[PDB]
Amino acid sequence: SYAALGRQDSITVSADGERFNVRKQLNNANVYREGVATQTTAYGKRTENVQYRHVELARVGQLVEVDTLEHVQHIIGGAGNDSITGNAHDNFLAGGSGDDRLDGGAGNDTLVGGEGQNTVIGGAGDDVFLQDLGVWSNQLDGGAGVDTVKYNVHQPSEERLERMGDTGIHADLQKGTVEKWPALNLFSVDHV
Amino acid sequence: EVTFNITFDVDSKASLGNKLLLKANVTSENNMPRTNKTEFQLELPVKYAVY
Ligand SMILES: *[C@@H]1O[C@H](CO[C@@H]2O[C@@H](C)[C@@H](O)[C@@H](O)[C@@H]2O)[C@@H](O[C@@H]2O[C@H](CO)[C@@H](O)[C@H](O)[C@H]2NC(C)=O)[C@H](O)[C@H]1NC(C)=O
Ligand SMILES: *[C@@H]1O[C@H](CO)[C@@H](O)[C@H](O)[C@H]1NC(C)=O
Ligand SMILES: [Ca+2]
Ligand SMILES: [Ca+2]
Ligand SMILES: [Ca+2]
Ligand SMILES: [Ca+2]
Ligand SMILES: [Ca+2]
């Protein structure tokens, strides 16, 4: 879970078979680092000094790190704009908040785009898309095989009931659009 | 030949998408086969007022 990453950060996950290479780009990251403090004492005459370790917080600007993952099937991105890619197994790819790109690759994968304007590619196999009746627009591609998009996972919120009432979605697979706020805004549409 | 204007009222909370279509065809008692002259439809862009 990379959910501790902020909005300004990002990850880029690439598959090398069964192994994953994760490139993390953290902008103005905050990191603990250990140095050497120095406390001094005078004892009535010429001074004797000491030192000791000291953990502390600092922001070190731009950081790039390359993590490595093995035997990992599920990844959760941070609050930024992540690019996450899976492999031939069954993966749980979640993007969280931000304009994330999720690609599952082969196999039966489950794909959760989260908030933001997400683009999601399923690949081959039978894939599952989970949606949340949000205000953003999403781009969804299923690929080969029989695929499913589900809108019933989340309970509707209070402001949704206040602004919309008891109306849900207007979905049409010939047009390829799913309108999550019909007749209230025309740009909260998922394209499938 | 007859020429005339037909007036319509557009609701202020209308939902017509971005593209509205009108369809009209003529008919008579003689009941003769339909022809391209009998049918006509034309398409008009739509915009929504925002303040
Ligand atoms: C401005 O909007 C047009 C139209 O968007 C469509 O109609 C709206 C009412 C809303 O329902 C949108 O979700 C619709 O997509 C955009 O033009 C369309 O662009 C898409 C690709 O982006 C294309 O597939 C459509 O054919 C286009 N349709 C028309 C009529 O042009 C246009 O791109 C938007 N402008 C900007 C700058 O985003
Ligand atoms: C006119 O168009 C309507 C469209 O619904 C159709 O039902 C009707 O049969 C048409 N009539 C003629 C005379 O073309
Ligand atoms: Ca994210
Ligand atoms: Ca996969
Ligand atoms: Ca997201
Ligand atoms: Ca897949
Ligand atoms: Ca698929």
Side-chain angles (χ1 to χ4, degrees), chain A residues 137 139 179 185-189 191, chain B residues 17-19 48:
Chain A
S137 182
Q139 288 275 350
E179 307 170 356
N185 63 6
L186 306 95
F187 284 88
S188 301
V189 179
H191 297 87
Chain B
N18 53 67
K19 189 173 178 285
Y48 296 82

Side-chain angles (χ1 to χ4, degrees), chain B residues 23 25-27 34 38-39:
Chain B
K23 183 175 174 66
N25 49 3
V26 65
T27 316
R34 306 167 75 207
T38 305
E39 182 85 61

